[PDB]
């Protein structure tokens, strides 16, 4: 057969000069790769800055705890009630090691659960981590890194000066219990001679710490509890300060937004998986061509329009929103649909229109979300993200929930109503001063929005100095903010497809993995994949005789009970369609290889189905 298929070897090197940026220069010098790398570096650095600014308080408290032990038997120890999302916290512990090394207050070992199956391996990795960490601040074999060598090394180095010997244990739940209790007794035996600090990483709760530490072990523990912030609070902070920021030209659609938050809130609390899914959304958006490299800030966008070729003109014509733009316009549409240079000259107005519409969308949302989410029962939700998904997914005024918001705001007393609208005005004005003024194309956005806010404030003064005026104030709020600057995504200004990402099907396919659905629809109707002219089934339980051989065996398998004799199975398959016995054996072997059946051991010539 193939040379890779060998009876002896299992791994096959194809070395090409390996000693001791995958793409070619055509792709990296393409503008869409440049804009994708720029937007991704900006988004990733902003999210990392948000994560560091959220961790910084607990970091200062842990560093103060270690330095307070250094100013000074039980080993001092600090439980850190971190979240379920364990991989994310390695950056937290790395920042703790960076601070402790920068202050020269301590040296840090990190004890992973994979390195400590036994007490010997735990002591060896602990001493090796402390000695090599001190060597890396300013190589003995792992067989000889005894705790006596750690004491001799600490006396040769830091006895003349006291550095703490911090021992991070990031995955406290994953440890063997006996190894961890013996290690705590070993570190408690050396207190006084060696200053140990034992910070921990408890993903669950303190009841796990009180359960895994027995009476003897907890007799030598002086632990203090720190609390990392909750994962949904971090998701809400990232979604409000990054994915809804005015300064980024790339926006998700409401379906993609709801899908990524559904993966976070309904499956895994890892921020990192949400970031990689947003990165795949950004890549799937920006790899469609240089027409999507127009999706950037306005000056580089004008440079990209003056760069453009012809395939980019074709893919800005093909996108669905251009067709209403053409039919809502004769010589002008001949010059648009053929002359190309006229479309190059008319692109900046459409790009400024789209970027200005999304800036006005963010400002009108920063208005509306306080005024709606302060209400009891919250028909449109509390935070900005739910109103973002609601105003993008469908027209907002036609929804029943907007009618409920108008009714429950109509039922208010005058004082709380005027205080609520004035709070919305002050919040919107603070947002217009803080976040839209530095931004390019923010002066025109402030020039559009600010007189409308002055008109709403004059309506507030009219209802202050004078019952039915509250309905006029609601009408002014509706038709200068909700109606004009908060349109549904289908009613967005044309060639908004360059800026939003609405293709949810392929990205849901490539992020959410469902092997069982593909195996099910391939073993039930092969015609969905093969697209034969003869193999179509009008219903999935028909069992036609022209099917591929795995499907017939799978259906005769599916249509009966648990334990299956092979012989009547073979008679039924022979009745459906020598080499036929070898084809049945090949199908049973493939169906066992997929895990659908298994051979019985206690009973020969029988098979049990593993599925239900």
């Amino acid at each position: 057969m193939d040379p890779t298929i060998s009876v002896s070897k299992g791994c096959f090197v194809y070395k090409n000069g390996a000693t001791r940026s995958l793409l070619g220069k055509e792709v990296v010098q393409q503008p869409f790769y440049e804009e994708y790398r720029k937007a991704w570096n900006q988004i990733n650095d902003h999210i990392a800055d948000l994560q560091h600014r959220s961790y910084a308080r607990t970091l200062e408290q842990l560093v103060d705890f270690v330095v307070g032990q250094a100013e000074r038997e039980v080993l001092p120890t600090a439980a850190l009630l971190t979240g379920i999302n364990q991989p994310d916290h390695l950056s937290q512990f790395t920042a703790l090691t960076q601070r402790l090394h920068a202050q020269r207050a301590a040296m840090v070992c990190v004890l992973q659960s994979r390195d400590c199956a036994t007490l010997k391996a735990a002591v060896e990795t602990l001493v090796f981590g402390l000695v090599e960490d001190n060597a890396e601040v300013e190589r003995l074999r792992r067989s000889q890194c005894t705790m006596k060598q750690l004491k001799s090394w600490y006396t040769n180095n830091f006895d003349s000066e006291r550095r703490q010997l911090v021992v991070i244990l990031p995955d406290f739940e994953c440890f063997n219990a006996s190894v961890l209790q013996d290690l705590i007794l070993i570190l408690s035996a050396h207190c006084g001679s060696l200053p140990f600090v034992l910070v921990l990483g408890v993903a669950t709760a303190m009841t796990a710490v009180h359960g895994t530490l027995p009476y003897h072990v907890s007799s030598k523990i002086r632990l203090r509890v720190f609390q990392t912030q909750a994962a949904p609070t971090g998701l809400n902070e990232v979604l409000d300060k990054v994915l809804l920021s005015p300064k980024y030209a790339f926006h998700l659609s409401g379906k993609t937004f709801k899908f990524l938050t559904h993966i976070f809130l309904y499956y895994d609390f890892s921020i990192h998986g949400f970031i990689q899914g947003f990165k795949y959304c950004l890549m799937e958006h920006f790899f469609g061509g240089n027409a999507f490299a127009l999706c950037t800030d306005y000056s580089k966008a004008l440079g990209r329009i003056k760069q453009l070729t012809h395939e980019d003109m074709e893919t800005i014509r093909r996108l669905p929103s251009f067709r209403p733009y053409v039919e809502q316009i004769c010589k002008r549409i001949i010059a648009v649909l053929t002359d190309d240079d006229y479309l190059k000259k008319k692109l900046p107005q459409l790009l400024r229109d789209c970027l200005l519409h999304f800036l006005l969308f963010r400002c009108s949302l920063e208005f509306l979300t306080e005024l709606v989410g302060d209400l009891p029962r919250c028909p449109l939700g509390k935070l900005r993200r739910e109103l973002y998904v609601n105003c993008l997914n469908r027209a907002i005024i036609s929804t029943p929930e907007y009618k409920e918001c108008l009714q429950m705001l109509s039922f208010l007393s005058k004082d709380e109503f005027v205080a609520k609208v004035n709070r919305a005005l002050e919040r919107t004005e603070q947002f217009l001063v803080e976040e839209i003024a530095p931004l390019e194309l923010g002066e025109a956005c402030t020039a559009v929005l600010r007189p409308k806010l002055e008109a709403i404030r004059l309506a507030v003064d009219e209802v202050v100095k004078a019952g039915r005026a509250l309905q006029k104030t609601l009408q002014l709020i509706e038709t200068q903010i909700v109606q004009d600057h908060l349109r549904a995504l289908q009613d967005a200004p044309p060639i908004h497809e360059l800026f939003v990402f609405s293709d949810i099907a392929t990205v849901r396919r490539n992020i959410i993995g469902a092997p069982r659905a593909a195996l099910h629809t391939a073993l039930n109707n092969p015609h969905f994949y093969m697209q034969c002219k003869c193999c179509e089934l009008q219903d999935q339980s028909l069992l036609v005789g022209t099917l591929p051989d795995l499907s017939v065996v799978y259906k005769l398998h599916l249509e009966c009970g648990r334990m299956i004799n092979l012989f009547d199975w073979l008679q039924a398959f022979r009745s459906v369609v020598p080499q036929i016995q070898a084809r049945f054996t090949r199908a049973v072997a493939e169906l066992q290889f997929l895990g659908y059946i298994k051979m019985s051991k206690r009973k020969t010539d029988h098979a049990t189905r593993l599925t239900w």
């Binding site: 067709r323 039919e327 004769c330 549409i333 001949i334 649909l337 053929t338």
Partner: peptide
């Protein structure tokens, strides 16, 4: 509606106008 036949029919509606 396919983009090519739509663009052709819109160009025909422009040239017939």
């Amino acid at each position: 509606e396919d983009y090519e036949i739509w663009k052709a029919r819109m160009l025909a509606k422009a040239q017939a106008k």
